[PDB]
Design an enzyme around this catalytic site. Sequence first.
Site, PDB file in Angstrom:
ATOM      1  N   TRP A  88     -10.656  -8.728   3.483  1.00 34.17           N
ATOM      2  CA  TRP A  88     -11.001  -8.915   2.075  1.00 34.17           C
ATOM      3  C   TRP A  88     -11.374 -10.338   1.664  1.00 34.17           C
ATOM      4  CZ3 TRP A  88     -10.970  -3.962   0.427  1.00 34.17           C
ATOM      5  CH2 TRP A  88      -9.862  -3.154   0.648  1.00 34.17           C
ATOM      6  N   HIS A 130       0.766   4.288  -2.809  1.00 30.03           N
ATOM      7  CA  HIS A 130       0.469   5.678  -2.491  1.00 30.03           C
ATOM      8  C   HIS A 130       1.585   6.701  -2.805  1.00 30.03           C
ATOM      9  CE1 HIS A 130      -3.308   5.707   0.173  1.00 30.03           C
ATOM     10  NE2 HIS A 130      -3.335   4.787  -0.776  1.00 30.03           N
ATOM     11  N   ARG A 136       0.816  -1.205   0.000  1.00 30.05           N
ATOM     12  CA  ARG A 136       0.000   0.000   0.000  1.00 30.05           C
ATOM     13  C   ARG A 136       0.865   1.277   0.000  1.00 30.05           C
ATOM     14  NH1 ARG A 136      -3.327   3.083   4.313  1.00 30.05           N
ATOM     15  NH2 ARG A 136      -4.679   4.380   2.987  1.00 30.05           N
TER      16      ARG A 136
HETATM   17  C1  HEM Z   1      -9.550   3.056  -6.814  1.00 33.32           C
HETATM   18  C2  HEM Z   1      -8.383   2.498  -6.183  1.00 33.32           C
HETATM   19  C3  HEM Z   1      -8.162   2.328  -4.807  1.00 33.32           C
HETATM   20  C4  HEM Z   1      -8.858   2.798  -3.687  1.00 33.32           C
HETATM   21  C5  HEM Z   1     -10.047   3.742  -3.587  1.00 33.32           C
HETATM   22  C6  HEM Z   1      -8.289   2.141  -2.586  1.00 33.32           C
HETATM   23  C7  HEM Z   1      -8.676   2.323  -1.245  1.00 33.32           C
HETATM   24  C8  HEM Z   1      -8.248   1.605  -0.118  1.00 33.32           C
HETATM   25  C9  HEM Z   1      -8.733   1.766   1.171  1.00 33.32           C
HETATM   26  C10 HEM Z   1      -9.846   2.713   1.617  1.00 33.32           C
HETATM   27  C11 HEM Z   1      -8.053   0.827   1.940  1.00 33.32           C
HETATM   28  C12 HEM Z   1      -8.164   0.567   3.423  1.00 33.32           C
HETATM   29  C13 HEM Z   1      -7.185   1.396   4.222  1.00 33.32           C
HETATM   30  C14 HEM Z   1      -7.196   1.118   5.722  1.00 33.32           C
HETATM   31  O1  HEM Z   1      -8.223   1.254   6.394  1.00 33.32           O
HETATM   32  O2  HEM Z   1      -6.158   0.765   6.275  1.00 33.32           O
HETATM   33  C15 HEM Z   1      -7.192   0.175   1.079  1.00 33.32           C
HETATM   34  C16 HEM Z   1      -6.252  -0.803   1.469  1.00 33.32           C
HETATM   35  C17 HEM Z   1      -5.235  -1.414   0.717  1.00 33.32           C
HETATM   36  N1  HEM Z   1      -4.982  -1.120  -0.561  1.00 33.32           N
HETATM   37 FE1  HEM Z   1      -6.126   0.119  -1.764  1.00 33.32          FE
HETATM   38  N2  HEM Z   1      -7.353   1.278  -2.981  1.00 33.32           N
HETATM   39  C18 HEM Z   1      -7.176   1.480  -4.302  1.00 33.32           C
HETATM   40  C19 HEM Z   1      -6.138   0.904  -5.060  1.00 33.32           C
HETATM   41  C20 HEM Z   1      -5.092   0.059  -4.649  1.00 33.32           C
HETATM   42  C21 HEM Z   1      -4.062  -0.393  -5.476  1.00 33.32           C
HETATM   43  C22 HEM Z   1      -3.888  -0.089  -6.969  1.00 33.32           C
HETATM   44  C23 HEM Z   1      -3.218  -1.112  -4.612  1.00 33.32           C
HETATM   45  C24 HEM Z   1      -2.004  -1.782  -4.856  1.00 33.32           C
HETATM   46  C25 HEM Z   1      -1.401  -2.125  -6.130  1.00 33.32           C
HETATM   47  C26 HEM Z   1      -3.840  -1.109  -3.357  1.00 33.32           C
HETATM   48  C27 HEM Z   1      -3.382  -1.793  -2.218  1.00 33.32           C
HETATM   49  C28 HEM Z   1      -3.940  -1.859  -0.937  1.00 33.32           C
HETATM   50  C29 HEM Z   1      -3.548  -2.712   0.090  1.00 33.32           C
HETATM   51  C30 HEM Z   1      -2.490  -3.810   0.058  1.00 33.32           C
HETATM   52  C31 HEM Z   1      -4.368  -2.403   1.161  1.00 33.32           C
HETATM   53  C32 HEM Z   1      -4.322  -3.051   2.535  1.00 33.32           C
HETATM   54  C33 HEM Z   1      -3.420  -2.302   3.493  1.00 33.32           C
HETATM   55  C34 HEM Z   1      -3.428  -2.820   4.934  1.00 33.32           C
HETATM   56  O3  HEM Z   1      -3.737  -3.984   5.183  1.00 33.32           O
HETATM   57  O4  HEM Z   1      -3.115  -2.057   5.830  1.00 33.32           O
HETATM   58  N3  HEM Z   1      -4.962  -0.389  -3.379  1.00 33.32           N
HETATM   59  N4  HEM Z   1      -7.335   0.631  -0.174  1.00 33.32           N
END
Ligand code: HEM
EC number: 1.11.1.5
Length: 291
Positions: free
Chosen positions: A188, A49, A45
Amino acid sequence: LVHVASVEKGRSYEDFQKVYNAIALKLREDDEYDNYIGYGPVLVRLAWHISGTWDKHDNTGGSYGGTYRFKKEFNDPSNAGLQNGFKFLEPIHKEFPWISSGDLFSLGGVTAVQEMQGPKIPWRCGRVDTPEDTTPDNGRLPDADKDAGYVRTFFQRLNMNDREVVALMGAHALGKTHLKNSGYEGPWGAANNVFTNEKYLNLLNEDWKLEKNDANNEQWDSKSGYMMLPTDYSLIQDPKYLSIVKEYANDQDKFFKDFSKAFEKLLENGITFPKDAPSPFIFKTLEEQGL
Ligand code: HEM
């Protein structure tokens, strides 16, 4: 803006393999974080970002300048919870002070995917730290409460097409959402720290229900106890995204190949590489090295 990749002076493949090894050994050691998910998910993540701020129109943002180190970007609401991935990487930067920030943040993402049994990601060195006034303003990273049209338009700013967007979103099988970070809560799926095509199978096979969570946000919850964002639900609402979801659900090796291409593209956006520059490095895993 032009951003030319400059290799850290005198460093070769073997130096970078040692930084990868240090990140991989510490991932192995600090296995207890976030109820035993480990730091692999928050590190991929973080790598997305610091790269996702790129704008193709004027070449601002992106991974090159390592500007997440600055307060404005570090305190962006959209980056809430990534301070954990930053604090993980910090002892590693003290150990190898010569690596640039952009190179360390992006390599942490590569190391996490490969150690979580994901595909090999080719990686290039050469990002150079840039001054605090090059730090992008908050607000360039995507909202979760939106639809497939928003998603397609957003990813066009990073010139990602449909196949690249659906492959990238496969990373939302990793880790979980946290109420205090984003206003969404839940796992997830079943295997949240091993890299697989599980997101696509859950998207096609679960019985999803729309509900409000304790932050008043809508999310899709399944009978199995899993959740999905509105923007993830997009992938089965749009007919073009849906044929690609089906493709990855039936073929994990095609998903691994395409994720590998699109994640490297994402980490390299906005960077010009000279052809004297070294070829992309393929790092060996701890397991391939017997460590
Ligand atoms: C429209 C695209 C995206 C949106 C709106 C989005 C939004 C989010 C949100 C709201 C979370 C939860 C954050 C939290 O509460 O800790 C999340 C988690 C995460 N996202 Fe995304 N995401 C997007 C794209 C991506 C992409 C392209 C990747 C990686 C190639 C990614 C990887 C991750 C990962 C690995 C987590 C989990 C992090 C953790 O466990 O702390 N996301 N995302």
